[PDB]
Amino acid sequence: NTKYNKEFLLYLAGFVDSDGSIIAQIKPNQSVKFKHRLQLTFDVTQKTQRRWFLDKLVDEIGVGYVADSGSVSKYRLSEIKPLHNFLTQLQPFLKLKQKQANLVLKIIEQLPSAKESPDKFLEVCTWVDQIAALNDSKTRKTTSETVRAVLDS
Amino acid sequence: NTKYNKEFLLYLAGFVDGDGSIIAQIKPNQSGKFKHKLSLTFKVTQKTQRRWFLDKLVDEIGVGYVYDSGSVSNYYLSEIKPLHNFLTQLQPFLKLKQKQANLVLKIIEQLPSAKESPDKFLEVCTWVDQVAALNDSKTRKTTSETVRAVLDSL
DNA sequence: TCAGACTTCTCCACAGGAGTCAGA
DNA sequence: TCTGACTCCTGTGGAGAAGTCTGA
Ligand SMILES: [Ca+2]
Ligand SMILES: [Ca+2]
Ligand SMILES: [Ca+2]
Ligand SMILES: [Ca+2]
């Protein structure tokens, strides 16, 4: 639970609203109770010639990782606890992605009670649909409906 | 001269380093001294669905305009005095585009003089080249060498 | 003549997902 | 059982130019 400098957070929020992404996903999984698991991700993308900027970001946030894919690189953070802490601090400064952040925070807090009632799980999956609805989603496959079809069994 | 709030400049700098562009151009221009007209632009691009976000910038910066192009909108500020004023205050907070901003400010200032000798003008054109070089430039046509071509000829 | 309002074009550099896998 | 690290892909939503056309 580290506390970030407020000027760092204001600049970072602007950069995230622009080149970043707050992502919620339902991923198929045979070994889990409801055959699906959730994955939340904070993401900043940038051409690989500017990877250094993403490197500095790892050091500043103090967690996460950079990966390369083609001519582009990404800072990523999916680890639940640090993510919940980070977004909680960034959230008030976000303008375009404030809702996505809030939905992700809500999802994380409900994670525990979501792995019990199939009905509660679906509810949380609906929060996921809402994040995707807010994003510029274009290649999405697995939704809360997908989960339903599967639960009906 | 409008003064801007600091927390505003901090967030905007981040957003500009992300979705923004600081652009220097040499444009043709028959009805002109050296047949090339200089043009500077600060710009922010966004899907037209989020045009409101750009509309607000017009109000917060206090000048500039929003226009549409396909599925996308842009905030633009080209007017030289306010551009100078705005970039001077933003520049301190920029991370990826700080050098482009300083070059634009440098060009704006050395402008009146750059319209004296074909050399002073041409030297400022090389400042334009640097901006483009620092940008992810892909569809550029007119450079300082395009200028030297029209000057070393006449 | 001229800066400044306004339009068009092109090539990515993002965003926003889909997955596989290995060690908890 | 399950999560978090890591890779790969699509389809734009950007960026970074290129231009035309007034008015004073
Ligand atoms: Ca963006
Ligand atoms: Ca959407
Ligand atoms: Ca960018
Ligand atoms: Ca470059």
CSV table of N, CA, C and O in Angstrom, one decimal, chain A residues 16-136:
chain,number,residue,atom,x,y,z
A,16,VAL,N,-3.1,8.0,-19.3
A,16,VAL,CA,-3.9,6.8,-19.3
A,16,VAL,C,-5.2,7.0,-20.1
A,16,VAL,O,-5.6,6.2,-20.9
A,17,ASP,N,-5.9,8.1,-19.8
A,17,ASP,CA,-7.1,8.5,-20.6
A,17,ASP,C,-6.8,8.5,-22.0
A,17,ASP,O,-7.7,8.2,-22.9
A,18,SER,N,-5.5,8.8,-22.4
A,18,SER,CA,-5.2,8.8,-23.8
A,18,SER,C,-4.7,7.5,-24.4
A,18,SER,O,-5.3,6.9,-25.3
A,19,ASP,N,-3.5,7.0,-23.9
A,19,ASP,CA,-2.8,5.9,-24.5
A,19,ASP,C,-3.0,4.6,-23.7
A,19,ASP,O,-2.4,3.5,-24.0
A,20,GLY,N,-3.8,4.6,-22.6
A,20,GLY,CA,-4.0,3.5,-21.7
A,20,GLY,C,-5.3,2.8,-21.9
A,20,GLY,O,-6.1,3.1,-22.8
A,21,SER,N,-5.5,1.8,-21.1
A,21,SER,CA,-6.7,0.9,-21.2
A,21,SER,C,-7.0,0.3,-19.9
A,21,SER,O,-6.1,-0.2,-19.2
A,22,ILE,N,-8.3,0.2,-19.5
A,22,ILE,CA,-8.7,-0.5,-18.3
A,22,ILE,C,-9.6,-1.6,-18.8
A,22,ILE,O,-10.7,-1.3,-19.4
A,23,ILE,N,-9.2,-2.8,-18.5
A,23,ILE,CA,-9.8,-4.0,-19.2
A,23,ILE,C,-10.3,-5.0,-18.2
A,23,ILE,O,-9.6,-5.3,-17.2
A,24,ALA,N,-11.5,-5.4,-18.5
A,24,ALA,CA,-12.1,-6.5,-17.7
A,24,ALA,C,-12.4,-7.7,-18.7
A,24,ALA,O,-12.9,-7.5,-19.7
A,25,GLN,N,-12.1,-8.9,-18.3
A,25,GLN,CA,-12.3,-10.1,-19.2
A,25,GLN,C,-12.9,-11.3,-18.4
A,25,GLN,O,-12.6,-11.5,-17.3
A,26,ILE,N,-13.7,-12.0,-19.2
A,26,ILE,CA,-14.2,-13.3,-18.7
A,26,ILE,C,-13.4,-14.3,-19.5
A,26,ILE,O,-13.5,-14.3,-20.8
A,27,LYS,N,-12.7,-15.2,-18.9
A,27,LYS,CA,-11.9,-16.2,-19.6
A,27,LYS,C,-12.3,-17.6,-19.3
A,27,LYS,O,-12.5,-18.0,-18.1
A,28,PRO,N,-12.5,-18.4,-20.3
A,28,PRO,CA,-12.9,-19.8,-20.2
A,28,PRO,C,-11.9,-20.6,-19.3
A,28,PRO,O,-10.7,-20.3,-19.4
A,29,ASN,N,-12.4,-21.4,-18.4
A,29,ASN,CA,-11.6,-22.2,-17.5
A,29,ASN,C,-12.3,-23.5,-17.0
A,29,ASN,O,-13.2,-23.4,-16.2
A,30,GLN,N,-11.9,-24.6,-17.5
A,30,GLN,CA,-12.5,-25.9,-17.1
A,30,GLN,C,-12.4,-26.3,-15.7
A,30,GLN,O,-13.3,-26.8,-15.1
A,31,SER,N,-11.3,-26.0,-15.0
A,31,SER,CA,-11.0,-26.4,-13.7
A,31,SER,C,-11.7,-25.6,-12.6
A,31,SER,O,-11.6,-26.0,-11.4
A,32,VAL,N,-12.3,-24.5,-13.0
A,32,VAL,CA,-13.0,-23.7,-12.0
A,32,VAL,C,-14.5,-24.0,-11.9
A,32,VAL,O,-15.1,-24.5,-12.8
A,33,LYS,N,-15.1,-23.7,-10.7
A,33,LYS,CA,-16.5,-24.0,-10.4
A,33,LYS,C,-17.4,-23.6,-11.6
A,33,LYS,O,-18.2,-24.5,-12.1
A,34,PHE,N,-17.4,-22.3,-12.0
A,34,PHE,CA,-18.3,-21.9,-13.0
A,34,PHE,C,-17.8,-21.9,-14.4
A,34,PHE,O,-18.3,-21.2,-15.3
A,35,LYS,N,-16.6,-22.6,-14.6
A,35,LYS,CA,-16.1,-22.8,-16.0
A,35,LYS,C,-15.5,-21.5,-16.6
A,35,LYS,O,-15.2,-21.4,-17.8
A,36,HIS,N,-15.5,-20.4,-15.8
A,36,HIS,CA,-14.9,-19.1,-16.2
A,36,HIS,C,-14.3,-18.4,-15.1
A,36,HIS,O,-14.8,-18.4,-13.9
A,37,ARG,N,-13.2,-17.7,-15.4
A,37,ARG,CA,-12.5,-16.8,-14.4
A,37,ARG,C,-12.5,-15.4,-14.9
A,37,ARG,O,-12.5,-15.2,-16.1
A,38,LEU,N,-12.4,-14.4,-14.0
A,38,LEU,CA,-12.2,-13.1,-14.4
A,38,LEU,C,-10.8,-12.6,-14.4
A,38,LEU,O,-10.0,-13.1,-13.6
A,39,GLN,N,-10.4,-11.7,-15.3
A,39,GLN,CA,-9.1,-11.1,-15.3
A,39,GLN,C,-9.2,-9.6,-15.6
A,39,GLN,O,-9.8,-9.2,-16.5
A,40,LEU,N,-8.6,-8.8,-14.7
A,40,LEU,CA,-8.6,-7.3,-14.8
A,40,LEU,C,-7.2,-6.9,-15.1
A,40,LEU,O,-6.3,-7.4,-14.5
A,41,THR,N,-7.1,-5.9,-16.0
A,41,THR,CA,-5.8,-5.4,-16.4
A,41,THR,C,-5.8,-3.9,-16.6
A,41,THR,O,-6.6,-3.3,-17.2
A,42,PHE,N,-4.7,-3.3,-16.0
A,42,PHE,CA,-4.4,-1.9,-16.3
A,42,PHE,C,-3.2,-1.9,-17.3
A,42,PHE,O,-2.3,-2.7,-17.1
A,43,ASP,N,-3.4,-1.1,-18.3
A,43,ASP,CA,-2.5,-1.3,-19.5
A,43,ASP,C,-2.2,0.1,-20.1
A,43,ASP,O,-3.0,1.0,-20.1
A,44,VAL,N,-0.9,0.3,-20.4
A,44,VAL,CA,-0.5,1.5,-21.1
A,44,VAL,C,0.4,1.0,-22.3
A,44,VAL,O,1.3,0.3,-22.1
A,45,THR,N,0.0,1.5,-23.5
A,45,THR,CA,0.7,1.0,-24.7
A,45,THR,C,1.5,2.2,-25.3
A,45,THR,O,1.2,3.3,-25.1
A,46,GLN,N,2.6,1.8,-26.0
A,46,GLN,CA,3.5,2.8,-26.7
A,46,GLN,C,4.5,2.1,-27.6
A,46,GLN,O,4.9,1.0,-27.3
A,47,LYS,N,4.7,2.7,-28.8
A,47,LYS,CA,5.7,2.3,-29.7
A,47,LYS,C,7.0,1.9,-29.0
A,47,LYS,O,7.4,2.5,-28.0
A,48,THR,N,7.7,0.9,-29.5
A,48,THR,CA,8.8,0.3,-28.7
A,48,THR,C,10.0,1.2,-28.7
A,48,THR,O,10.8,1.1,-27.7
A,49,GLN,N,10.2,2.1,-29.6
A,49,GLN,CA,11.3,3.1,-29.5
A,49,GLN,C,11.1,3.9,-28.2
A,49,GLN,O,12.0,4.6,-27.8
A,50,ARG,N,9.9,3.9,-27.7
A,50,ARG,CA,9.7,4.7,-26.4
A,50,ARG,C,9.5,3.9,-25.2
A,50,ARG,O,8.9,4.3,-24.2
A,51,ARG,N,10.0,2.6,-25.3
A,51,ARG,CA,9.8,1.6,-24.2
A,51,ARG,C,10.4,2.2,-22.9
A,51,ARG,O,9.8,1.9,-21.8
A,52,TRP,N,11.4,3.0,-23.0
A,52,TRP,CA,12.0,3.6,-21.8
A,52,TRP,C,11.0,4.3,-20.9
A,52,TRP,O,11.0,4.2,-19.6
A,53,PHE,N,10.0,5.0,-21.5
A,53,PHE,CA,8.9,5.6,-20.8
A,53,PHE,C,8.1,4.6,-20.0
A,53,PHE,O,7.7,4.9,-18.8
A,54,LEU,N,7.8,3.5,-20.6
A,54,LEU,CA,7.1,2.4,-19.9
A,54,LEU,C,8.0,1.7,-18.8
A,54,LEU,O,7.5,1.2,-17.8
A,55,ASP,N,9.3,1.7,-19.1
A,55,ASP,CA,10.3,1.2,-18.1
A,55,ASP,C,10.2,2.1,-16.8
A,55,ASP,O,10.0,1.6,-15.7
A,56,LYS,N,10.3,3.4,-17.0
A,56,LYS,CA,10.2,4.3,-15.9
A,56,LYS,C,8.9,4.1,-15.1
A,56,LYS,O,8.9,4.2,-13.9
A,57,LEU,N,7.8,3.8,-15.9
A,57,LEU,CA,6.5,3.6,-15.2
A,57,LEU,C,6.5,2.4,-14.3
A,57,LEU,O,5.8,2.5,-13.3
A,58,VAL,N,7.2,1.4,-14.6
A,58,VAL,CA,7.3,0.2,-13.7
A,58,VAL,C,8.0,0.6,-12.4
A,58,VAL,O,7.5,0.3,-11.3
A,59,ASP,N,9.0,1.4,-12.5
A,59,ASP,CA,9.8,1.8,-11.4
A,59,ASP,C,8.9,2.7,-10.5
A,59,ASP,O,8.9,2.6,-9.3
A,60,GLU,N,8.1,3.6,-11.2
A,60,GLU,CA,7.3,4.6,-10.4
A,60,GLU,C,6.1,4.0,-9.7
A,60,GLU,O,5.8,4.3,-8.6
A,61,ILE,N,5.4,3.1,-10.4
A,61,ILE,CA,4.3,2.4,-9.8
A,61,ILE,C,4.8,1.4,-8.8
A,61,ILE,O,4.2,1.1,-7.8
A,62,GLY,N,6.0,0.8,-9.1
A,62,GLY,CA,6.6,-0.1,-8.2
A,62,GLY,C,6.2,-1.5,-8.4
A,62,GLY,O,6.6,-2.4,-7.6
A,63,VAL,N,5.4,-1.8,-9.4
A,63,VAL,CA,4.9,-3.1,-9.6
A,63,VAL,C,4.5,-3.2,-11.1
A,63,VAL,O,4.4,-2.1,-11.8
A,64,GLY,N,4.2,-4.4,-11.6
A,64,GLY,CA,3.9,-4.5,-13.0
A,64,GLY,C,5.1,-4.9,-13.9
A,64,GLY,O,6.2,-5.1,-13.4
A,65,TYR,N,4.8,-4.9,-15.2
A,65,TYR,CA,5.9,-5.4,-16.2
A,65,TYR,C,5.7,-4.8,-17.6
A,65,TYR,O,4.5,-4.5,-17.9
A,66,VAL,N,6.7,-4.7,-18.3
A,66,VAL,CA,6.7,-4.3,-19.7
A,66,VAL,C,6.9,-5.5,-20.6
A,66,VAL,O,7.8,-6.3,-20.3
A,67,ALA,N,6.1,-5.7,-21.7
A,67,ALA,CA,6.3,-6.7,-22.7
A,67,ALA,C,6.3,-6.1,-24.1
A,67,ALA,O,5.7,-5.0,-24.3
A,68,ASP,N,7.0,-6.7,-25.0
A,68,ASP,CA,7.1,-6.2,-26.4
A,68,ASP,C,6.3,-7.2,-27.3
A,68,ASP,O,6.3,-8.4,-27.1
A,69,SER,N,5.7,-6.6,-28.4
A,69,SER,CA,5.0,-7.4,-29.3
A,69,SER,C,4.9,-6.7,-30.7
A,69,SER,O,4.1,-5.8,-30.9
A,70,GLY,N,5.8,-7.0,-31.6
A,70,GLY,CA,6.0,-6.3,-32.8
A,70,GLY,C,6.7,-5.0,-32.6
A,70,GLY,O,7.6,-4.9,-31.8
A,71,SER,N,6.2,-3.9,-33.2
A,71,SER,CA,6.8,-2.6,-33.1
A,71,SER,C,6.3,-1.8,-31.9
A,71,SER,O,6.5,-0.6,-31.8
A,72,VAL,N,5.6,-2.5,-31.0
A,72,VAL,CA,5.0,-1.8,-29.9
A,72,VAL,C,5.2,-2.6,-28.6
A,72,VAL,O,5.4,-3.8,-28.6
A,73,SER,N,5.1,-1.9,-27.5
A,73,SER,CA,5.3,-2.4,-26.1
A,73,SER,C,4.2,-2.0,-25.2
A,73,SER,O,3.5,-1.0,-25.5
A,74,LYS,N,4.0,-2.6,-24.1
A,74,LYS,CA,2.9,-2.4,-23.1
A,74,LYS,C,3.4,-2.5,-21.7
A,74,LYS,O,4.1,-3.4,-21.3
A,75,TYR,N,3.0,-1.5,-20.9
A,75,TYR,CA,3.1,-1.7,-19.4
A,75,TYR,C,1.8,-2.4,-19.0
A,75,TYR,O,0.7,-2.0,-19.4
A,76,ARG,N,1.9,-3.4,-18.2
A,76,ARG,CA,0.8,-4.1,-17.7
A,76,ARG,C,0.8,-4.4,-16.2
A,76,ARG,O,1.8,-4.6,-15.6
A,77,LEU,N,-0.4,-4.3,-15.6
A,77,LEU,CA,-0.6,-4.7,-14.2
A,77,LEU,C,-1.9,-5.4,-14.0
A,77,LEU,O,-3.0,-4.8,-14.3
A,78,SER,N,-1.9,-6.6,-13.6
A,78,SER,CA,-3.1,-7.4,-13.4
A,78,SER,C,-3.3,-7.9,-12.0
A,78,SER,O,-4.3,-8.3,-11.6
A,79,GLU,N,-2.1,-8.0,-11.3
A,79,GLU,CA,-2.1,-8.5,-9.9
A,79,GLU,C,-3.2,-7.7,-9.1
A,79,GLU,O,-3.2,-6.5,-9.1
A,80,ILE,N,-4.1,-8.4,-8.5
A,80,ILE,CA,-5.3,-7.8,-7.9
A,80,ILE,C,-5.1,-6.8,-6.8
A,80,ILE,O,-5.6,-5.7,-6.9
A,81,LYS,N,-4.3,-7.1,-5.8
A,81,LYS,CA,-4.1,-6.2,-4.7
A,81,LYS,C,-3.4,-4.9,-5.0
A,81,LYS,O,-3.9,-3.8,-4.7
A,82,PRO,N,-2.3,-5.0,-5.7
A,82,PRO,CA,-1.6,-3.7,-6.1
A,82,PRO,C,-2.5,-2.9,-7.1
A,82,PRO,O,-2.5,-1.7,-7.0
A,83,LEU,N,-3.2,-3.6,-8.0
A,83,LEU,CA,-4.1,-3.0,-8.9
A,83,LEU,C,-5.2,-2.2,-8.2
A,83,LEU,O,-5.5,-1.1,-8.5
A,84,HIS,N,-5.8,-2.9,-7.2
A,84,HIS,CA,-6.9,-2.2,-6.4
A,84,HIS,C,-6.3,-1.0,-5.8
A,84,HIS,O,-7.0,0.1,-5.8
A,85,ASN,N,-5.1,-1.0,-5.2
A,85,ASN,CA,-4.5,0.1,-4.6
A,85,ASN,C,-4.2,1.2,-5.5
A,85,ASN,O,-4.4,2.4,-5.2
A,86,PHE,N,-3.7,0.9,-6.7
A,86,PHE,CA,-3.2,1.9,-7.7
A,86,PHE,C,-4.4,2.6,-8.3
A,86,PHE,O,-4.5,3.8,-8.3
A,87,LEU,N,-5.4,1.9,-8.8
A,87,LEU,CA,-6.6,2.4,-9.4
A,87,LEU,C,-7.4,3.3,-8.4
A,87,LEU,O,-8.0,4.3,-8.8
A,88,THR,N,-7.4,2.9,-7.1
A,88,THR,CA,-8.1,3.7,-6.1
A,88,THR,C,-7.5,5.1,-6.0
A,88,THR,O,-8.2,6.0,-5.8
A,89,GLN,N,-6.2,5.2,-6.2
A,89,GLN,CA,-5.5,6.5,-6.2
A,89,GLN,C,-5.6,7.2,-7.5
A,89,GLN,O,-5.7,8.5,-7.4
A,90,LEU,N,-5.6,6.5,-8.6
A,90,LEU,CA,-5.7,7.2,-9.9
A,90,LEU,C,-7.1,7.7,-10.2
A,90,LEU,O,-7.3,8.7,-10.9
A,91,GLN,N,-8.1,6.9,-9.7
A,91,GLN,CA,-9.5,7.1,-10.1
A,91,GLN,C,-10.0,8.5,-10.1
A,91,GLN,O,-10.8,8.9,-11.0
A,92,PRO,N,-9.7,9.3,-9.1
A,92,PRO,CA,-10.3,10.6,-8.9
A,92,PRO,C,-9.8,11.6,-10.0
A,92,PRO,O,-10.5,12.6,-10.3
A,93,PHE,N,-8.7,11.3,-10.6
A,93,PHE,CA,-8.1,12.1,-11.6
A,93,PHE,C,-8.5,11.8,-13.1
A,93,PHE,O,-8.2,12.6,-14.0
A,94,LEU,N,-9.0,10.6,-13.3
A,94,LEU,CA,-9.4,10.1,-14.6
A,94,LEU,C,-10.6,10.8,-15.1
A,94,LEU,O,-11.5,11.1,-14.3
A,95,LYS,N,-10.7,11.1,-16.4
A,95,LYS,CA,-11.8,11.7,-17.0
A,95,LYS,C,-12.6,10.8,-18.0
A,95,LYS,O,-13.8,10.7,-17.9
A,96,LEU,N,-11.8,10.2,-18.9
A,96,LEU,CA,-12.4,9.3,-19.9
A,96,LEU,C,-12.7,7.9,-19.4
A,96,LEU,O,-13.6,7.2,-19.8
A,97,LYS,N,-11.9,7.5,-18.4
A,97,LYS,CA,-11.9,6.1,-18.0
A,97,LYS,C,-12.2,6.0,-16.5
A,97,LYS,O,-11.9,4.9,-15.9
A,98,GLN,N,-12.8,7.0,-15.9
A,98,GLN,CA,-13.1,7.0,-14.5
A,98,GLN,C,-14.1,5.8,-14.2
A,98,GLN,O,-14.0,5.1,-13.2
A,99,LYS,N,-15.1,5.7,-15.0
A,99,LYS,CA,-16.1,4.6,-14.8
A,99,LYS,C,-15.5,3.2,-14.9
A,99,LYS,O,-15.8,2.4,-14.0
A,100,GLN,N,-14.8,2.9,-16.0
A,100,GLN,CA,-14.1,1.7,-16.1
A,100,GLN,C,-13.3,1.3,-14.8
A,100,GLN,O,-13.5,0.2,-14.2
A,101,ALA,N,-12.5,2.3,-14.3
A,101,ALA,CA,-11.8,2.1,-13.1
A,101,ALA,C,-12.7,1.8,-11.9
A,101,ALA,O,-12.3,0.9,-11.1
A,102,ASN,N,-13.8,2.5,-11.8
A,102,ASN,CA,-14.7,2.3,-10.7
A,102,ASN,C,-15.3,0.9,-10.8
A,102,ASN,O,-15.5,0.2,-9.8
A,103,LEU,N,-15.7,0.5,-12.0
A,103,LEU,CA,-16.3,-0.8,-12.2
A,103,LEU,C,-15.3,-1.9,-11.8
A,103,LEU,O,-15.6,-2.9,-11.2
A,104,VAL,N,-14.0,-1.7,-12.2
A,104,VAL,CA,-12.9,-2.7,-11.9
A,104,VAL,C,-12.8,-2.8,-10.4
A,104,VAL,O,-12.7,-3.9,-9.8
A,105,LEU,N,-12.7,-1.6,-9.7
A,105,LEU,CA,-12.6,-1.6,-8.2
A,105,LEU,C,-13.8,-2.3,-7.6
A,105,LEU,O,-13.7,-3.1,-6.6
A,106,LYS,N,-15.0,-2.1,-8.1
A,106,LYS,CA,-16.2,-2.8,-7.6
A,106,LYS,C,-16.1,-4.3,-7.8
A,106,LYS,O,-16.4,-5.1,-6.9
A,107,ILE,N,-15.7,-4.7,-9.0
A,107,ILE,CA,-15.5,-6.1,-9.4
A,107,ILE,C,-14.6,-6.8,-8.4
A,107,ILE,O,-14.9,-7.9,-7.9
A,108,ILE,N,-13.4,-6.2,-8.1
A,108,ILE,CA,-12.4,-6.8,-7.3
A,108,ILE,C,-12.9,-7.0,-5.9
A,108,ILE,O,-12.6,-8.0,-5.2
A,109,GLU,N,-13.7,-6.0,-5.3
A,109,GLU,CA,-14.2,-6.1,-4.0
A,109,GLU,C,-15.3,-7.2,-3.9
A,109,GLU,O,-15.5,-7.7,-2.8
A,110,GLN,N,-15.9,-7.5,-5.0
A,110,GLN,CA,-16.9,-8.6,-5.0
A,110,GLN,C,-16.4,-9.9,-5.4
A,110,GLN,O,-17.1,-10.9,-5.3
A,111,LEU,N,-15.1,-10.0,-5.8
A,111,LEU,CA,-14.5,-11.2,-6.2
A,111,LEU,C,-14.7,-12.4,-5.3
A,111,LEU,O,-15.0,-13.5,-5.7
A,112,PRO,N,-14.6,-12.1,-3.9
A,112,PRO,CA,-14.8,-13.1,-2.9
A,112,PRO,C,-16.2,-13.7,-2.9
A,112,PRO,O,-16.3,-15.0,-3.0
A,113,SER,N,-17.2,-12.9,-2.9
A,113,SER,CA,-18.6,-13.4,-2.9
A,113,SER,C,-19.1,-13.8,-4.2
A,113,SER,O,-20.3,-14.2,-4.3
A,114,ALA,N,-18.3,-13.7,-5.3
A,114,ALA,CA,-18.7,-14.0,-6.6
A,114,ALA,C,-18.5,-15.5,-6.9
A,114,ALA,O,-19.0,-16.1,-7.9
A,115,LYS,N,-17.6,-16.1,-6.1
A,115,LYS,CA,-17.2,-17.5,-6.3
A,115,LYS,C,-18.1,-18.4,-5.5
A,115,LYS,O,-17.6,-19.5,-5.0
A,116,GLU,N,-19.3,-18.1,-5.3
A,116,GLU,CA,-20.2,-18.9,-4.4
A,116,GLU,C,-21.6,-19.2,-5.0
A,116,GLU,O,-21.9,-20.3,-5.2
A,117,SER,N,-22.3,-18.1,-5.4
A,117,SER,CA,-23.6,-18.3,-6.0
A,117,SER,C,-23.4,-18.0,-7.5
A,117,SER,O,-23.0,-16.9,-7.9
A,118,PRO,N,-23.8,-19.0,-8.3
A,118,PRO,CA,-23.8,-18.8,-9.8
A,118,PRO,C,-24.5,-17.5,-10.2
A,118,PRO,O,-24.1,-16.9,-11.2
A,119,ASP,N,-25.5,-17.1,-9.5
A,119,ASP,CA,-26.3,-15.9,-9.8
A,119,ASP,C,-25.4,-14.7,-9.5
A,119,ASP,O,-25.5,-13.7,-10.2
A,120,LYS,N,-24.7,-14.7,-8.4
A,120,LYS,CA,-23.8,-13.6,-8.0
A,120,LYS,C,-22.6,-13.4,-9.0
A,120,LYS,O,-22.2,-12.3,-9.4
A,121,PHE,N,-22.2,-14.6,-9.5
A,121,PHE,CA,-21.1,-14.6,-10.5
A,121,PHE,C,-21.6,-13.9,-11.8
A,121,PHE,O,-20.9,-13.0,-12.3
A,122,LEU,N,-22.7,-14.3,-12.3
A,122,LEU,CA,-23.3,-13.6,-13.5
A,122,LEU,C,-23.4,-12.1,-13.3
A,122,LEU,O,-23.1,-11.4,-14.2
A,123,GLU,N,-23.9,-11.7,-12.1
A,123,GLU,CA,-24.0,-10.3,-11.8
A,123,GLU,C,-22.7,-9.6,-12.1
A,123,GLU,O,-22.6,-8.6,-12.8
A,124,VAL,N,-21.6,-10.1,-11.5
A,124,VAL,CA,-20.3,-9.5,-11.7
A,124,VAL,C,-19.8,-9.6,-13.1
A,124,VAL,O,-19.2,-8.6,-13.6
A,125,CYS,N,-20.2,-10.6,-13.9
A,125,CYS,CA,-19.9,-10.7,-15.3
A,125,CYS,C,-20.6,-9.5,-16.1
A,125,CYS,O,-20.1,-9.1,-17.1
A,126,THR,N,-21.8,-9.1,-15.5
A,126,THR,CA,-22.5,-8.0,-16.1
A,126,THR,C,-21.7,-6.6,-15.9
A,126,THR,O,-21.8,-5.7,-16.8
A,127,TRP,N,-21.0,-6.5,-14.8
A,127,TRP,CA,-20.2,-5.4,-14.6
A,127,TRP,C,-19.0,-5.4,-15.7
A,127,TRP,O,-18.6,-4.3,-16.1
A,128,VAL,N,-18.6,-6.6,-16.0
A,128,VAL,CA,-17.6,-6.8,-17.1
A,128,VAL,C,-18.1,-6.3,-18.4
A,128,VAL,O,-17.4,-5.6,-19.1
A,129,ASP,N,-19.3,-6.7,-18.8
A,129,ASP,CA,-20.0,-6.2,-20.0
A,129,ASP,C,-19.9,-4.7,-20.0
A,129,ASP,O,-19.7,-4.0,-21.1
A,130,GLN,N,-20.2,-4.1,-18.9
A,130,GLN,CA,-20.3,-2.6,-18.8
A,130,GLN,C,-19.0,-1.9,-19.1
A,130,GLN,O,-19.0,-0.9,-19.8
A,131,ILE,N,-17.9,-2.5,-18.6
A,131,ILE,CA,-16.6,-2.0,-18.9
A,131,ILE,C,-16.3,-2.1,-20.4
A,131,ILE,O,-15.8,-1.1,-21.0
A,132,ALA,N,-16.6,-3.2,-21.0
A,132,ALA,CA,-16.4,-3.4,-22.4
A,132,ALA,C,-17.3,-2.4,-23.2
A,132,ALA,O,-16.9,-1.8,-24.2
A,133,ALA,N,-18.5,-2.2,-22.7
A,133,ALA,CA,-19.4,-1.2,-23.4
A,133,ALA,C,-18.8,0.2,-23.4
A,133,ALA,O,-18.9,0.9,-24.3
A,134,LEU,N,-18.2,0.5,-22.2
A,134,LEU,CA,-17.5,1.8,-22.1
A,134,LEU,C,-16.3,2.0,-23.0
A,134,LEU,O,-16.0,3.0,-23.5
A,135,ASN,N,-15.5,0.9,-23.1
A,135,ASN,CA,-14.3,0.9,-23.9
A,135,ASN,C,-14.7,1.0,-25.4
A,135,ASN,O,-15.9,0.9,-25.8
A,136,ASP,N,-13.7,1.2,-26.3
A,136,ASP,CA,-14.0,1.1,-27.7
A,136,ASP,C,-13.8,-0.4,-28.1
A,136,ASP,O,-13.0,-0.8,-29.0
